[PDB]
Every structure is written in structure tokens, then in C-alpha cells.
């Protein structure tokens, strides 16, 4: 009768989302109050982390200081967590989604549906592959996405922000909006899944360019042009690459312009790009110094874009994306970045 929800993931973001979804499932009649959350088990200094969560109602490791609602139940086995869910909320690091889908494949409730909160992009036959497609194809369920200018710490703290839900099915879109929306977490539902999703990968390429601007000492008007041309390349690339409908207007949603802006004024891609431009240190060197060795996604995405556009003969139509690639991997002097924007397709 009422729809059962499983939150597949329990990290910083998954626990922030638990707070909201646990809250709204308990409140709202149409949702089963019992919300399962799959927790990868960890020795929390002796006690099982899933034990600590069900007793203390606090993800002491990944969202310390916050009270997860009591109707949210940690479950160490993902199949047991999801077996009865009508709605699956995928919120794990991209690196673990494959494993989780492998365990879940063939164990879901009939007509179960999913929504991916996983930002970024995967690899596929067409070069880039959307994570929501990896999930939906492996599990055989219809997929929505949730993407926007938001971060777990602020969503847990109830700091005002918005997000975009991409869902092809209007009725399912409205259901997901009811599950996730609060006075400080505002949702717009749009029908273009792929377009909402591809923004999250492309925005980080634009952020590398924005960081180059900061590191080369350009002003805000130059930077605003880099961001805007970057947005226009996002639109043009989605229109040529995405299946499903692509509208310019979708880029004016939170997943598009707002996430772009926040990523270009703060975030690891911008920060490392600026340091690269200022200091001549390699992306690799800065990754070790600043991100404990984490791979920065902006440069890696630019490399994938380069291969896609080379096979289509369109490298010259995306000068900002391709300047990020050439600066990061082919030793193009970062100081020439702006020159690559002086004959842009948008101004032809």
C-alpha cells in the first residue's frame, strides 16, 4: 500500500538524505515510516557501525553530531535492505555502485524504481556512460536522478538550497518530490534525466577552466565569460551526445547553472586548477598534496570528451573543453587558455 523506501548508501550524503527522507516518510501518509538504509559494516573501535546507528541514531563516522530519525534502520546486507523497497535511493560513492548493483541484480521487488544521487559519469561504449544507466541496465529498473547545487553538511544543517529531479514519469517524479522536499531543500522536477545527469560531469571541466582564470589573475568579467562559454559547451555537447530530450532550459535548473556557479567559485577542481596555473605543479603533484591522492574528475572527464569529439570530428567546436584537456595532458601552456576562447563557435 504505502511505498517502501530503501536508501542504498549511508555516507555523508546518504546520512544527510536519510535525515530528510526518514523525516518525510514518517510524516507523510503515502510512505512507509520504516526506511531501511544499507550500511557497509565497519569496526567502530570494536562495536559494529550498524549497531551504533540503530542504538545511538547517529552515523558517528560519516555524519557525526546529527540525529538520524529513529524510523531509519541500518541494515548491513544490501539485499535485505532493498528486498522489499518500492523506491531505491542510490547514494554511494561512484566506486562502489558496481559492486552494490552486482549484489542487488535479480533481488528487487517487482516494479521497483530507483533514483541516483551519484554525481559524475562512468565509462561505456559511447565513451561516457551515465551512472543512472549503469544502474538501471544492470538491475532492470527505471531510474530518476537528483542533482543540484547542494552539499551534505548544509542539507543536514537545514541550510536553504535547491535541487533538480530528473524523472521521465510525471507520477513518479511527483512521488520523489514529496519524499525529498523540505522547506529548505526545494525541488524542481524536470523530465530530462540524461540532461540533468550529464551536467554533474561536465561542470567540473568548466571549473578547471574557471580555476585557470583565478590562477592567472583574470577578473570576474573574464571568469564570467569562461563560465558562460563553458555552459554553452555543456549545452551543445549534451545536445549532440545525450539520448533523451535535451532542452537549454534544463541548464537553467539547479543541476545546471547553479551547480556550475558554485563549482566554479568553490570546490576541488577549481582549487587544484588555480594552483596548477599559479605554481606550475602538475595535476598529479597537487592531487597528492591536496586530495590525499584522490583523482580529480574534471581533467579525467575532459580526456573522455576529447576521445568522443575526435571520433566525431568536433574537437574544434569545443575549444574550452579541449583547452582544459590540452593544458592538463598535452603540455599546452596554461597561460594560453584564454587565447583558445578568442574564436569561439558562440561568436561566429
Ligand X SMILES: NC(=O)c1ccc[n+]([C@@H]2O[C@H](COP(=O)([O-])OP(=O)(O)OC[C@H]3O[C@@H](n4cnc5c(N)ncnc54)[C@H](O)[C@@H]3O)[C@@H](O)[C@H]2O)c1
Closest CA to 85 of 37, 26, 142, 14: 37
Segment interacting with its own copies, rule: CB under 8 A, options 29-37, 227-235, 280-288, 316-324 = 227-235
Q: CA–CA distance from 304 to each of 5, 24, 84 (Å)? A: 35, 39, 38
Exactly one of 7, 17, 19, 33 binds K ion (CB under 5 A); that residue is 33
CB 73 within 8 A of CB 24: no
Exactly one of 12, 50, 116, 188 binds its own copies (CB under 8 A); that residue is 188
CA 133 to chain centre: 14
Give catalytic status of residue 48 as yes or no: no
Exactly one of 24, 144, 150, 301 binds its own copies (CB under 8 A); that residue is 150
How are beta strands 161-166 and 185-190 bridged, if at all?
A: parallel
**Is residue 341 involved in binding its own copies (CB under 8 A)?**
yes
Name, in order, each residue with C-beta under 8 angstroms of 321's C-beta and a sequence gap of 6 or more: 202, 205, 230, 233, 237, 302, 305, 306, 309
**Is residue 118 involved in binding ligand X (CB under 6 A)?**
yes
Closest CA to 202 of 260, 115, 131, 117: 260
**Is residue 258 involved in binding its own copies (CB under 8 A)?**
yes
**Is residue 297 involved in binding ligand X (CB under 6 A)?**
no
Coil, strand or helix: which one is 122? strand
| DSSP H or E stretch at residue 161 | strand 161-166
Q: Which is nearer to ligand X, 105 or 239 (CB)?
A: 105
CB 324 within 8 A of CB 298: yes
**Is residue 66 involved in binding ligand X (CB under 6 A)?**
no
Least gap, CB of 122 to ligand X (angstroms): 11
Q: Pick one of K ion, its own copies, ligand X, none as the site partner of residue 118 (Cβ within 5 to 8 A by kind).
A: ligand X
Q: Which is nearer to its own copies, 102 or 157 (CB)?
A: 157
Q: Which of 19, 119, 203, 271 is catalytic?
A: 203
Exactly one of 71, 248, 285, 332 binds its own copies (CB under 8 A); that residue is 248
Q: In b/e form, how buried is each residue of 196-216, taking b as 16+ CB within 10 angstroms?
A: bbbbbbbbbbbbbbbbbbbbe
Residues 77-116 binding ligand X (CB under 6 A) are 91-94, 96, 99
CA 345 to chain centre: 28
CB 18 within 8 A of CB 37: yes
Backbone angles phi, psi at 266, to 5 degrees: -175, 135
**Is residue 151 involved in binding its own copies (CB under 8 A)?**
yes
Exactly one of 26, 224, 240, 314 binds its own copies (CB under 8 A); that residue is 224
Segment interacting with ligand X, rule: CB under 6 A, options 145-153, 170-178, 265-273, 284-292 = 145-153
| Contacting residues toward its own copies, per CB under 8 A | 149-151, 154, 159-162, 181, 183-184, 186-188, 218-225, 227-229, 231-232, 235, 248-249, 251-254, 257-259, 261-262, 265-266, 338, 341-344, 346-347
What are the catalytic residues?
203
| Contacting residues toward ligand X, per CB under 6 A | 9-14, 40, 62, 91-94, 96, 99, 117-120, 150-152
Amino acid at each position: 500500500a504505502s511505498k517502501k523506501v530503501c536508501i542504498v548508501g549511508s555516507g555523508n550524503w546518504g546520512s544527510a538524505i536519510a535525515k530528510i527522507v526518514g523525516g518525510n516518510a514518517a510524516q507523510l501518509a503515502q510512505f512507509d515510516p520504516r526506511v531501511t538504509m544499507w550500511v557497509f559494516e565497519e569496526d567502530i573501535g570494536g562495536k559494529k557501525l550498524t549497531e551504533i546507528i540503530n542504538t545511538q541514531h547517529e552515523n558517528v563516522k560519516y555524519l557525526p553530531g546529527h540525529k538520524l530519525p529513529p524510523n531509519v534502520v541500518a541494515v548491513p546486507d544490501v539485499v535485505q535492505a532493498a528486498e522489499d523497497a518500492d523506491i531505491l535511493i542510490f547514494v554511494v560513492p561512484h566506486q562502489f555502485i558496481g559492486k552494490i548493483c552486482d549484489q542487488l541484480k535479480g533481488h528487487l521487488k517487482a516494479n521497483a524504481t530507483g533514483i541516483s544521487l551519484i554525481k559524475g559519469v562512468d565509462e561505456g561504449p559511447n565513451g561516457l556512460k551515465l551512472i543512472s544507466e549503469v544502474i538501471g541496465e544492470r538491475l532492470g529498473i527505471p531510474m530518476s536522478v537528483l542533482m543540484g547545487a547542494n552539499i551534505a553538511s548544509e542539507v543536514a544543517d537545514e541550510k536553504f538550497c535547491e535541487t533538480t529531479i530528473g524523472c521521465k514519469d510525471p507520477a513518479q517524479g511527483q512521488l520523489l518530490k514529496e519524499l525529498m522536499q523540505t522547506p529548505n531543500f526545494r525541488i524542481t522536477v524536470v523530465q530530462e534525466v540524461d540532461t540533468v545527469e550529464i551536467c554533474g560531469a561536465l561542470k567540473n571541466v568548466v571549473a578547471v577552466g574557471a580555476g585557470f582564470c583565478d590562477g592567472l589573475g583574470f577578473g570576474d568579467n573574464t571568469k564570467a565569460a569562461v563560465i558562460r562559454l563553458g555552459l554553452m559547451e555543456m549545452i551543445a555537447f549534451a545536445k549532440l551526445f545525450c539520448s533523451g530530450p535535451v532542452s537549454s532550459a534544463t541548464f537553467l535548473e539547479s543541476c545546471g547553472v547553479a551547480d556550475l556557479i558554485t563549482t566554479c567559485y568553490g570546490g576541488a577542481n577549481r582549487k587544484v586548477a588555480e594552483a596548477f596555473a599559479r605554481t606550475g605543479k602538475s595535476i598529479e603533484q597537487l592531487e597528492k598534496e591536496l586530495l590525499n591522492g584522490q583523482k580529480l574528475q574534471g581533467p579525467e572527464t575532459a580526456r573522455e570528451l576529447y576521445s568522443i569529439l575526435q571520433h566525431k570530428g568536433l574537437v574544434d567546436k569545443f575549444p574550452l573543453f579541449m583547452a582544459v584537456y590540452k593544458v592538463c595532458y598535452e603540455g599546452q601552456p596554461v597561460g594560453e587558455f584564454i587565447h583558445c576562447l578568442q574564436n569561439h563557435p558562440e561568436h561566429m
